[PDB]
Amino acid sequence: YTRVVWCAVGPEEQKKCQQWSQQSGQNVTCATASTTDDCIVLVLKGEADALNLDGGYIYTAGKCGLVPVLAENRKSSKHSSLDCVLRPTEGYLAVAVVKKANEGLTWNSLKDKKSCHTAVDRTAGWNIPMGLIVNQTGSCAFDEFFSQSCAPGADPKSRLCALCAGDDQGLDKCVPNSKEKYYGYTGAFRCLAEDVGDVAFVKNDTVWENTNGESTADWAKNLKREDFRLLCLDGTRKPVTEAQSCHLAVAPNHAVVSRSDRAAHVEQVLLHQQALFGKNGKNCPDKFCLFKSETKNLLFNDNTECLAKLGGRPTYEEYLGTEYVTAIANLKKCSTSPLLEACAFLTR
């Protein structure tokens, strides 16, 4: 079985993956599920092989035995010309973000406001913010800390899904895939933009990429960096350029995961795949660009140069950073989920 079956979360991702299968002559094939958690289960069953994952999902899969194959990697300023696949990863910034126009809203007045989150269990969208809010307030009731949210993946009869828009017909509110208008990085930021929420937790890179003519997408052509601000943990606010000084935390980059018995096959298949279709591969754009989704972030984030190598053969823990595994761990004392419970024994 040479083919690497890839896991597409949601129908929009499934289409780009169907495309990739066709271009790759079945070097890659598609399986899908509605959610990432579901996909992780296919990867476990052996029904799929691999998929690229936010660091928080990496911890879920990590727990269930899956391991990290190659990290997503983006442009760089520091050391900005060693080869992409061997150049170390620099992480990204998880930020709290607001309309500038609104005032009196700051980290310390967040309680009882309205939130937009990438989706539940994700790193910047969720794990970091809710992480801190737990440590600070000192209670496990983050489900009630904000007045309402969009938090795809949460309980959809609950308040954390109260603000989610669903798709075009409004079907499937709160399903944590790209058919939910406010899903993921761009979803969240848009939930901010349309004033459905007060704060939105995202990465620095997400505001720059959807303001000031960078997206030519109806919801975001006219958006202006000026109209937004970043809450720091100071109590303070700064514009988006000071993100380095105004960020909640540093996050580990998305990364591909698979089963260990499938890691090397997958890593190799992918390295060739990116050479074919990656940022500067033979066939991109003449044929297929693996890293472009028109700002919809499918399979991969659109600002990925290449998938890069990892020091040794790490585990979720080496890969994520021991500092983060604890932040996630401690947040997770305040809530259970099917997959961590079902897999808890593997890692005891």
Ligand X SMILES: *[C@@H]1O[C@H](CO)[C@@H](O[C@@H]2O[C@H](CO)[C@@H](O[C@@H]3O[C@H](CO)[C@@H](O)[C@H](O)[C@@H]3O)[C@H](O)[C@H]2NC(C)=O)[C@H](O)[C@H]1NC(C)=O
Ligand Y SMILES: *[C@@H]1O[C@H](CO)[C@@H](O)[C@H](O)[C@H]1NC(C)=O
Binding residues for hydrogencarbonate: 118, 122, 124-125
Q: Which does 253 bind (CB under 5 to 8 A by kind): ligand X, Fe ion, its own copies, none?
A: none
- Identity of the residue, 36 or 211, whose beta carbon is nearer to ligand X in the bound complex: 211
Contacting residue, 13, 54, 198, 205, with Fe ion by CB under 5 A: 54
Residues forming a β-bridge with 150: 116
Residue with smaller CB distance to ligand Y, 51 or 128: 128
For the CB of residue 277, give the shortest distance to ligand Y in the complex, in Å.
9
Whether the bond into 11 is cis, omega within 30 of 0: no
Query: Residue 93's binding partner, choosing from ligand X, its own copies, ligand Y, none, with beta-carbon cut-off 5 to 8 A by kind?
Result: ligand X
Contact range with its own copies by CB under 8 A, out of 54-62, 71-79, 258-266, 324-332: 324-332
- Give whole-number Cα distances, 138 to 37, 46, 116, 145, in Å: 28, 41, 22, 11
| Minimum separation from the CB atom of position 232 to ligand X (A) | 13
Angle CA(241)–CA(120)–CA(19) in degrees, nearest 5?
A: 85
Interacting residue with ligand X among 70, 276, 327, 343 (CB under 6 A): 276
Any contact of residue 27 with ligand Y (CB under 6 A)? yes
State yes or no: residue 333 binds its own copies (CB under 8 A). yes
Q: Which is nearer to ligand Y, 136 or 337 (CB)?
A: 136
Interaction mask 123-142, Fe ion, x per CB under 5 A: x-------------------
Tokens (6 digits) for 33: 């599920």
Q: Which of 108, 109, 136, 260 binds ligand Y (CB under 6 A)?
A: 136
CA quadruple 248, 253, 254, 260: dihedral sign: negative
Token pair belonging to 280 = 């500067």
205 sits near Fe ion (criterion: CB under 5 A): no
Distance CA 85, CA 79 (A): 13
Residues 14-43 contacting its own copies, CB under 8 A: 17-22, 25-27, 29-31
* Nearest to its own copies of 30, 97 (CB atom): 30
Residue 123 near which of ligand X, its own copies, Fe ion, none (CB within 5-8 Å, type-dependent): Fe ion
- Least distance in Å: CB of 60 to ligand X? 16
Q: In sequence order, which residues have a C-beta less than 8 Å from that of residue 164 and are 6 or more positions away?
A: 150, 151, 152, 156, 173, 174, 180, 181, 182
| CB atoms closer than 10 angstroms to residue 47 | 13
| Partner interacting with residue 35 (select from ligand X, ligand Y, Fe ion, none; CB below 5-8 Å by kind) | none
**Residue from 298, 206, 307 nearest 257 by CA:** 307
Q: Dihedrals φ, ψ of 276, to 5°?
A: -70, -40
Q: Is 22 in the site for ligand Y (CB under 6 A)?
A: yes
Asked if residue 32 lies in contact with residue 5, where contact means CB atoms within 8 angstroms, the answer is no
Annotated binding site for Fe(3+): 54, 92, 185, 254
Smallest separation, CB 74 to ligand X (Å) = 7
Query: In angstroms, what is the minimal distance from the CB of 148 to ligand X?
Result: 28
Tell me: does residue 32 bind ligand Y (CB under 6 A): no
CA–CA distance, 193 with 346 (Å, rounded to integer) = 42
Q: Is 273 helix (H, G, I), strand (E, B) or coil?
A: helix
Cα–Cα distances (Å) from 7 to 14, 21, 51, 268, 297, in that order, read: 8, 12, 5, 17, 14
Strand partners, 94: 203, 249
Contact partners, residue 72, CB within 8 Å, separation at least 6: 52, 89, 253, 254, 255, 300, 301, 304, 307, 308
How many whole angstroms separate alpha carbon 256 and alpha carbon 3?
A: 16
Query: Which residues of the shown chain bind its own copies in the complex (CB under 8 A)?
Result: 1-3, 5, 17-22, 25-27, 29-31, 134-140, 326, 329-331, 333-336
Query: Which residues of the shown chain bind ligand X in the complex (CB under 6 A)?
Result: 24-25, 27, 75, 77, 80, 93, 204-205, 208, 214, 243-244, 272, 276
Query: Which residues of the shown chain bind ligand Y in the complex (CB under 6 A)?
Result: 22, 24-25, 27, 135-136
